[PDB]
Amino acid sequence: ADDALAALGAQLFVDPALSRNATQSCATCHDPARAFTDPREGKAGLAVSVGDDGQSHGDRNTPTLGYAALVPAFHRDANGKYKGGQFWDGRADDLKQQAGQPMLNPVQMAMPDRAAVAARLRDDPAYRTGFEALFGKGVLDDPERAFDAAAEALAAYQATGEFSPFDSKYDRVMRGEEKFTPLEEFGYTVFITWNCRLCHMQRKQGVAERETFTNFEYHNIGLPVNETAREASGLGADHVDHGLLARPGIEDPAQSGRFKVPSLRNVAVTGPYMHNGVFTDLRTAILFYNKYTSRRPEAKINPETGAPWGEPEVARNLSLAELQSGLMLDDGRVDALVAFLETLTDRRYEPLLE
Amino acid sequence: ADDALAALGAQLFVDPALSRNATQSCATCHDPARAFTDPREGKAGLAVSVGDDGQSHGDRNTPTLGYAALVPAFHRDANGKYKGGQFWDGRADDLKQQAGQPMLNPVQMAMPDRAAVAARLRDDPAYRTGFEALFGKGVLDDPERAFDAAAEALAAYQATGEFSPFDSKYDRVMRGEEKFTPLEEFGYTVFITWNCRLCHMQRKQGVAERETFTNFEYHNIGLPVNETAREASGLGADHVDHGLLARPGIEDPAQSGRFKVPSLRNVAVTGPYMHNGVFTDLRTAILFYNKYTSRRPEAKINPETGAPWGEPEVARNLSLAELQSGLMLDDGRVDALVAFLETLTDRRYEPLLEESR
Amino acid sequence: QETQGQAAARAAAADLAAGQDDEPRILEAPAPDARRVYVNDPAHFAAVTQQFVIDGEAGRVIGMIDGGFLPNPVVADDGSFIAHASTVFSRIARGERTDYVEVFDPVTLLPTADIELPDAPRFLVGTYPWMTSLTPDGKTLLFYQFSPAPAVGVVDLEGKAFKRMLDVPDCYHIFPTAPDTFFMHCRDGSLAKVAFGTEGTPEITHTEVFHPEDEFLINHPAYSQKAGRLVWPTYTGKIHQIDLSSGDAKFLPAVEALTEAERADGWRPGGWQQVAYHRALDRIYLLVDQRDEWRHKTASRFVVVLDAKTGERLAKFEMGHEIDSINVSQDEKPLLYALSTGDKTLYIHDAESGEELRSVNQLGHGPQVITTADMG
Amino acid sequence: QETQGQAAARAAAADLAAGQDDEPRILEAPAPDARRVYVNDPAHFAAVTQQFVIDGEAGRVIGMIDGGFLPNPVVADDGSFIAHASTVFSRIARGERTDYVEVFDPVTLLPTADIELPDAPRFLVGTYPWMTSLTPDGKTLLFYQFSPAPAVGVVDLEGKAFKRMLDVPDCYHIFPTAPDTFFMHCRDGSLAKVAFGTEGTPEITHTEVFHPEDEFLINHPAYSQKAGRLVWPTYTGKIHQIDLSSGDAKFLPAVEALTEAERADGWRPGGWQQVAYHRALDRIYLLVDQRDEWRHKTASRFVVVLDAKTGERLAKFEMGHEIDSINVSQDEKPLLYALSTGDKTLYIHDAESGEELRSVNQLGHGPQVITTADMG
Amino acid sequence: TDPRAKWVPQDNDIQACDYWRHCSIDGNICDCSGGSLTNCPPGTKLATASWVASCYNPTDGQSYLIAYRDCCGYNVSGRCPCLNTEGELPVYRPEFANDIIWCFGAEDDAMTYHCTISPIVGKAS
Amino acid sequence: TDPRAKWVPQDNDIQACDYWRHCSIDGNICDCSGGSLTNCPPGTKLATASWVASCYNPTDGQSYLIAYRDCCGYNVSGRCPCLNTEGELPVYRPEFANDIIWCFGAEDDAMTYHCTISPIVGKASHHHHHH
Ligand code: HEC
Ligand code: HEC
Ligand code: HEC
Ligand code: HEC
Ligand SMILES: [Ca+2]
Ligand SMILES: [Ca+2]
Ligand code: NA
Ligand code: NA
Ligand code: NA
């Protein structure tokens, strides 16, 4: 059952047969060697990913799958804050619900429908054995059950310890196995006393058992459009990415421009950053937060472009209460934060830190 | 000497031979039956007095001579306050310096000069005898000496107990011989806790042995011109009574419009009030002070005229710090002050209160 | 006898043990109720002051309200709001004065109105509860002015605006009886009824003089607005009661709070809020002690409780502390609140037995005034 | 033997007996002199505060100044004025914040300037004398800003205007050396030298790092602006002295105010203004007692006096009270002022012998900061 | 020290609450914040208003009228607080009432209470 | 009551200054002015700034990160005043410093000090300067 389901998902995950031209698997964009993100250079660099047809670019940055299985299913909590879900806009409830969507998305894996997904599954004798042992005889002859089963296998694969090993230095330090360096401890202290912890910590107080450095909420931090990614996505220069509000069922205009607080785990190796991969450097992403706190000229300017950050793609619902902290991060605290953030790199990616 | 000098002054005081036409003695304007003030009606009522010529009117109200002998001689104290003196503008240093001035003032007793005064004193064998005994043979032949000796005699006479007997009800109550009526005691209490005490008490603190209800200072309380008196005196519609600034030797424009705080002894019997006799009633004089405190429109209206009090004659240097006390005297407190002030009447003028009351 | 602080520790340790999360946030005070008590600390004339909102049943501070110089607190009887008239200056105790009324939500304690009073018109005095007073409907606050003369200021709390000053005779304190009417106590020994409109000379009527000039009526009489009862001790513990419920003043018979023997042995009332009146029980409480006749503002260690109708003594409690002010909750089985200015402590007593139940200490610097709502 | 109050009673009785009159008025404080001491009461973070002006010789309060929230007092060494940077709010502790500098005439205590500081730029922190500082010419006040980042505000006392904010690095405190330069202590353990013109970024230079990360320099160094001597104790009673008197920082032998065996038997500096520096005597006074290592803000009952040159202990006084703060008058035969926050009492000591001469009690609620002028 | 005992005046210490002239003082003795028995501290503003009492002077066997005046425009001193009420009447007899902040007339409209002075203005009657 | 003696944390009364979480509190315990251990009283504004201390819980022998937060915009409560300084460092290490009025990020720009809450936000690590 649970091993075997996940092993099935493991097959599917790397199988380009689930793409129209059979040129792309999940693993093409969520490359395990790149904390399950897309190392492939496209028109907008690494901001966005290219689909199976070799032309179509998405309009959002491919996120890591690492630790995505710790995100609760999408729900509105008693304070009226939306939490959890999958995708940058929480439009998928959970992993299972998310898994079939790349397969059928014409700008990603581009399979025409569930039936064509099922037919590719029937081509492979290994799948007929694998899927039948777990979900019963004839499962692949029924497109719905086939596609749901593929989705469940994928979700189960993503829930394995491989995707969320909690073996970062931060983890070893919290178990008393290791000590942070001075700079990393400074970084941590800053992280938990400054505004970051207001959103990139699981809990408001007390101690999380499996901290993933997100509270799973939705916030508009006022980011600009990634012009070249937006050009590449072909959604047009008139387009506005409304974030959470694009989730079907969410109607509240207070949610326009809000995106899910990403886990900062492996953040050091999953550039570029933000939902549109607008920032190539981690340091830049940290610096962006100073635009709300710092009175200095250098705070209005994206150090990667030398030009002003740009106006928010969505100018309302900014989380100003959290972002206008009254204190700006000096260079040493930015260093400290980068250091701390790098401690959240899973063991197997520590080699990628250069 | 002291007895006899006073006794000479007594004779001079009531002697009309010291006026040009012999109609007028000190006692004519400073009538002993009226606490040494002028009961006579003139063209501005009792506000200002008429001289020996029968026509000339002063521009200021004739003040009492009672208790005038307690006033210190004119001086500037160390706080730059001027104090004491005689006349409403302190222009005389003391009683002696004051005493000759009515004699030679053409608006008053109108003798032409000291010589004419001496010639009068010589017509009288009792003066030859009285002056010679105290001042020596030939005194009446020397106009300067005779005039000075007459002033001295007159100052001596004003310093007698007859002028300052301290036998008012207030004095008897303070000795413990009687008590105030309850209205009087409230009046007394208000007097001593309100702004009256900042000006109408001898001392800033401690206890005066012989209280005369004045600090002898000079204060512009923002009085209007008394039009009728000012008309009668002939000084002109553009005339300004500068008060203390008129004293020769005072040049400080900050003294313009300040007058000597009067003793409030016999105040009940010595109306009309203020330096120009502008208010006829004692209660009005008290109510004037509410102009600086009360927010009620009535407080800006002279109850005697029904019209605004008027612009101050001198609109600068008002004593606003003391005046603008922030507290208005209700009518219970004005009644009480009247009752208290009436306790300041000397025993012999008690019978005059009936009419005032 | 497990304390506030001990129960909290226990509860917090359990949430940590259980991994229970909670959002740090701003608490709401519990709903106003009959056992809520307010203590104002005029802080011995300090420029700024504090009111403590207290759950008298628990003996717990549930909130605080900042104020200025000798503010006058009022508490709507029905619990809907609280307010005060207060005074601040631009540079602490000097510079431009601003008198103002704030109205506050009684659970969030947030100001819902801030209403300037023009020309700095408040009477600045050691706090007398009945020198600022709400009308029974809660819509108007009436504040006393002494300077330049006695006057009363009218503030519209519904429209959040100052209305007008009313000219009054030589009278003191403000006991409102209607949306447009209040009584004052006059120098002449009468009460003055003042009836006022949006404009015009108010209708002012005086009662008969009800005390001689040598009988001294204290500055802190008890007034139940809901009963229209004015309970007014003299210096000797003679208690005048005046029934204003009919809308006009009826003088009730005088009662002595102390006995003839007690009086001959030097017993007299004394403190600040010396007297309390429990509306439902029709009971007077009076802080008393043996004292010289001119030690009338000193604390007292004894509370006599007497039946308002008959004058019959019901109890004499030995408070066990130096008490300056008393008041009572207005519910059944009332608490008798005994505020010590010197201890800065509200002692909360059972008003039937006198037994001390609990206490709330650290109530500022010189707390003097207890206010409860009469919510029943 | 006869106290101030007693002598005053005899004088008043003589005046009454002699019939001596005298005008009630506002007194002028005695000319500022070496023995004037100021005690600031931050009042445990109260929204308004008090400064006491004390004549240390007679142990007499000779005046007071009111302040707002956590003001920074500065006293011009030449006695010509005092000033503070203060903070008020439009409704006690809430509403619009005004930061401002007041300058006062030191005999009339009247304010001679009130200069608004734009955009509420003051650092609100338990009071550190060297978070706001006069330049030696007295013409300029510099105040530290923490939010959004370390910065320093330049206030022209002569023009009576705020000029501008200087961007500094990650540093703290302000020790002006010249009309256009001051030093600050940096996170990285250097001092920074900051020279400002009328325009442009200032010029900033860093000394050598002079202490390790785990050596903790207290918030209250003693700085003698005239001697250019910055005296900077660490938590263990180790004392840096830095000489800024040539325009650049030079580091004097670090000295130890405690002995190894004292340390070992638990002696460490402790309190608020833990250190004083007497310029003419070149002598450091350090408050110390036996305390745990993290009780570094508690009162001490011992002062040790040590030569600044040698490090030699000249004296150890048993103060006979819980002392939070010390300072000294800067004249010959200096007083040693020992301020007890707890006792609200300034104990005035002969600095030579350490004996208690006299004391001034009732200094507010939680007095912490002693300032004197260096008039010599 | 027994608060309820009859007040016992003395004429030997003006900073003490039993000093004879303080028989109806309420607040703080100005002498303890830089004023004196009859003068205000620097920076404060002297009221012109007053309330009185008749205070027995055990030096001379005579009772004097003390017309107290407030020093205003400063927050309360906090030194030598006293409250005596010899002959003190309720607020409706304000001339003998001492809870009132008697700061009227003080320069600059000062109305905050700092401390009180105790000058003599007459002998009782 | 020996002010200089080592601090002896208890886990039995949050209103006492020896309560284990108050190990670097400076001011007043919010629980005494109508807040609670981790919530502000009514009327005040919770700051987003904090200083942190690693505080020893005597009960489980563990060290927890307390990120203190100020409740601002009221005058100081004056109830349950407390000043502890476990691991407290000078102002140039502001993250551990507790004389600072940490009212930054409070609603309405509230910057006046009323009281301090003592919530847990981690299980140390640790720190270097204070374990
Ligand atoms: C062509 C590139 C590409 C391929 C192939 C692809 N992904 Fe994604 N993945 C993305 C992008 C882009 C997003 C973010 C999309 C958005 O937010 O709308 C994403 C988001 C997700 C998320 C949500 C993660 C988060 O934190 O919100 C999950 C889970 C996921 N992908 C799983 C898969 C699986 C399983 C497959 C194989 C069926 C797959 N992906 C194939 C690009 C791809
Ligand atoms: C108001 C909530 C909030 C606060 C405060 C905040 N963050 Fe974020 N952060 C987010 C959200 C939401 C995103 C994703 C935004 C997007 O793409 O639209 C994010 C993105 C990031 C990323 C990009 C991660 C990735 O996978 O792309 C980094 C790095 C990051 N934040 C670090 C920080 C640091 C360091 C702090 C404190 C200085 C901070 N954040 C404060 C909410 C917050
Ligand atoms: C015509 C009426 C009149 C006569 C006669 C007159 N007086 Fe006067 N008296 C006045 C007036 C008017 C004043 C105030 C004048 C002024 O202030 O300039 C005055 C003022 C004085 C004062 C000053 C009182 C004060 O309080 O300032 C003295 C003393 C005085 N008179 C004494 C005398 C003596 C002595 C005589 C006789 C030699 C005398 N007077 C004759 C009308 C008169
Ligand atoms: C600022 C000082 C000052 C104060 C305060 C003041 N007075 Fe006077 N008072 C005077 C002066 C000066 C005069 C004479 C004014 C003039 O005629 O120009 C005067 C005149 C009077 C007179 C008229 C006396 C006469 O002989 O004509 C009465 C009556 C009087 N004052 C009563 C009072 C009472 C009652 C109070 C308290 C309400 C009071 N004053 C407060 C200065 C003052
Ligand atoms: Ca990325
Ligand atoms: Ca007259
Ligand atoms: Na939607
Ligand atoms: Na006339
Ligand atoms: Na002249």
Residues A65 and A53 in one domain: yes
Q: How many CB atoms lie within 10 A of CB B208?
A: 15
Q: How many CB atoms lie within 10 A of CB C156?
A: 17
Q: Is some CB atom of chain E closer than 8 A to the CB atom of B115?
A: no
B239 among annotated binding-site residues: no
For residue A304, the SS3 value is: coil
Considering only the beta carbons, identify the residue of E19, E41, E80 that sits closest to D27.
E41
Tokens of C113: 């109105």
Query: For residue F52, what is the domain's CATH number?
Result: 2.60.30.10
**DSSP result, A179-231:** ---HHHHHHHHHHHHSGGGGTSSS-SSS--SS--S---BEEB--PPP-HHHHH
Q: Please name which of A247, A264, A239, A262 lies closest in space to residue A314, comparing C-alpha atoms.
A: A239
- Mutate: best of C88, C122, C124, C183, partner E, most E CBs <10 A: C124
B90 lines ligand 3 (CB under 6 A): no
For residue E113, the enclosing domain spans 1-125
Evaluate whether E77 touches E114 at the Cβ level (below 8 Å). yes
Instruction: List residues of chain D with CB under 8 Å from any CB of chain A.
Output: 147-149, 167, 169-170, 187-188, 213
Tokens of B351: 């019978």
Q: What backbone phi and psi angles, to 5 degrees, belong to D251?
A: -90, 110
For chain D, the chains sharing at least 3 beta-carbon pairs closer than 8 angstroms are A, B, C, E, F
Q: Which residue of chain D comes nearest to C86, CA vs CA?
A: D91
Considering only the beta carbons, identify the residue of C6, C8, C362 that sits closest to F37.
C8
Q: Which residue of chain B comes nearest to C165, CA vs CA?
A: B295
Evaluate whether C224 touches C279 at the Cβ level (below 8 Å). yes
In terms of DSSP bridges, do strands F45-46 and D36-41 run parallel, antiparallel, or are they unpaired? unpaired
Q: In whole angstroms, what is the distance from residue D36 CA to residue E34 CA?
A: 13
Burial class (CB in 10 A: 0-12, 13-18, 19+), D130: buried
E104 alpha carbon, distance to own chain's centre: 15
Q: How close C308 comes to chain E (CA, Å)? A: 23
Q: Please name which of D24, D51, D84, D121 lies closest in space to residue D369, comparing C-alpha atoms.
A: D51
Q: What backbone phi and psi angles, to 5 degrees, belong to A118?
A: -55, -45
CA of C296 from ligand 3 middle (Å) equals: 55
CB < 8 Å from B in window 62-121 of E? 64-65, 67, 95-96, 104-105, 107, 119-121
Q: Is some CB atom of chain D closer than 8 A to the CB atom of E38?
A: yes
Q: In whole angstroms, what is the distance from residue A341 CA to residue A282 CA?
A: 9
Instruction: List residues of chain C with CB under 8 Å from any CB of chain A.
Output: 15-16, 19-24
Interchain CB distance below 8 Å, C88 and D93: no
- Mutate: best of A190, A295, A324, partner D, most D CBs <10 A: A295
Interchain CB distance below 8 Å, C94 and D66: yes
Q: Write the single-letter amino acid at D93.
A: A
Q: In whole angstroms, what is the distance from residue E18 CA to residue B284 CA?
A: 43
Residues B241 and B103 in one domain: no
In terms of DSSP bridges, do strands D250-251 and E26-28 run parallel, antiparallel, or are they unpaired? unpaired
In F1-131, beta strands by DSSP E: 26-28, 45-46, 51-56, 63-72, 81-83, 113-117, 120-122
Considering only the beta carbons, identify the residue of C16, C19, C23 that sits closest to A204.
C23
Q: Could you check whether the bond before residue C296 is cis, i.e. omega within 30 degrees of 0? A: no
Q: Which residues contact A151 (CB under 8 A, 6 or more apart)?
A: A96, A97, A99, A100
Q: In whole angstroms, what is the distance from residue A202 CA to residue A213 CA?
A: 6
Taking the alpha carbons of B11, B17, B20, B25 in that order, is the dihedral positive or negative? positive
Q: Resolution to 1 decimal, in Å?
A: 1.9
Q: How many CB atoms lie within 10 A of CB D76?
A: 20
Instruction: List residues of chain B with CB under 8 Å from any CB of chain D.
Output: 79, 203-207, 209
Q: How many CB atoms lie within 10 A of CB B353?
A: 14
Q: In whole angstroms, what is the distance from residue C361 CA to residue D109 CA?
A: 37
Q: Is some CB atom of chain E closer than 8 A to the CB atom of C46?
A: yes
Query: For residue A9, what is the domain's CATH number?
Result: 1.10.760.10
Evaluate whether A83 touches A216 at the Cβ level (below 8 Å). yes
Residues B328 and B179 in one domain: yes
Q: Which residue is it, tokens 């203590």?
A: C39
Tokens of B15: 């002697």
Side-chain-side CA neighbours of F96 within 13 Å: the count stands at 27
For the domain covering C1-376, report its CATH number. 2.130.10.10
Q: Which residues contact C3 (CB under 8 A, 6 or more apart)?
A: F13, F15
Tokens of D282: 């070149």
Residues of F in contact with A207 (CB under 8 A): 64, 120, 122-123
Q: In whole angstroms, what is the distance from residue D119 CA to residue D121 CA?
A: 5
Evaluate whether E92 touches C185 at the Cβ level (below 8 Å). yes
Q: Could you check whether the bond before residue B272 is cis, i.e. omega within 30 degrees of 0? A: yes
Q: Please name which of C114, F110, C68, C95 lies closest in space to residue D100, comparing C-alpha atoms.
A: C95
Considering only the beta carbons, identify the residue of D3, D25, D362 that sits closest to E78.
D362
Reduce the secondary structure of B235-293 to three states and give it as a string: CCCCCCCCEHHHCCCCCCHHHCCEEECCCCCCHHHCCCECCCCCECCHHHHHHHHHHHC
Tokens of D303: 């002062």
Q: In whole angstroms, what is the distance from residue B327 CA to residue C147 CA?
A: 6
- Mutate: best of D86, D87, D88, D92, partner C, most C CBs <10 A: D92
Q: Please name which of B24, B25, B17, B28 lies closest in space to residue B120, comparing C-alpha atoms.
A: B17
Q: How many CB atoms lie within 10 A of CB A298?
A: 9
Residues with CB under 5 Å of ion ligand 6 are B 61, 270
Residues of E in contact with D102 (CB under 8 A): none
Q: How many CB atoms lie within 10 A of CB D19?
A: 11
Q: Which residue of chain D comes nearest to B202, CA vs CA?
A: D21
Number of domains in chain A: 2
- Active site residue: F7, F11, F13, F51, which one? F51
Evaluate whether C271 touches C323 at the Cβ level (below 8 Å). yes
Helix, strand, coil shares, percent, chain F, to 5:
10, 30, 60
Q: Which residue of chain F comes nearest to C105, CA vs CA?
A: F43
CA-nearest residue, atom 12 of ligand 1 = A62
Q: In whole angstroms, what is the distance from residue C106 CA to residue B127 CA?
A: 94
Q: Could you check whether the bond before residue C220 is cis, i.e. omega within 30 degrees of 0? A: no
Taking the alpha carbons of D293, D298, D303, D306 in that order, is the dihedral positive or negative? positive
Helices A143-158 & A114-123 angle (0-180, nearest 10): 80
Considering only the beta carbons, identify the residue of C94, C219, C294 that sits closest to E73.
C94
Q: Which residue of chain D comes nearest to B207, CA vs CA?
A: D19
Q: In whole angstroms, what is the distance from residue B192 CA to residue B200 CA?
A: 9
Give the technique used to solve this structure: X-ray
Helix, strand, coil shares, percent, chain E, to 5:
10, 30, 60
Residues of C in contact with D68 (CB under 8 A): 92
Tokens of D356: 């208690």
Interchain CB distance below 8 Å, B182 and C213: yes
Q: How close F86 comes to chain C (CA, Å)? A: 20
For residue B157, the SS3 value is: helix
Number of domains in chain F: 1
Q: How close F129 comes to chain C (CA, Å)? A: 25
B199 lines ligand 4 (CB under 6 A): yes
Q: How close A332 comes to chain F (CA, Å)? A: 12
Residues B219 and B310 in one domain: yes
B95 lines ligand 3 (CB under 6 A): yes
For residue B148, the enclosing domain spans 1-165
Residues A221 and A320 in one domain: yes
Q: In whole angstroms, what is the distance from residue C169 CA to residue C202 CA?
A: 11
Q: In whole angstroms, what is the distance from residue B313 CA to residue B302 CA?
A: 15
B87 lines ligand 3 (CB under 6 A): yes
Q: In whole angstroms, what is the distance from residue D263 CA to residue C156 CA?
A: 67
CA-nearest residue, atom 43 of ligand 2 = A199
A319 lines ligand 2 (CB under 6 A): yes
Evaluate whether A26 touches A103 at the Cβ level (below 8 Å). no
Q: How close F92 comes to chain D (CA, Å)? A: 5
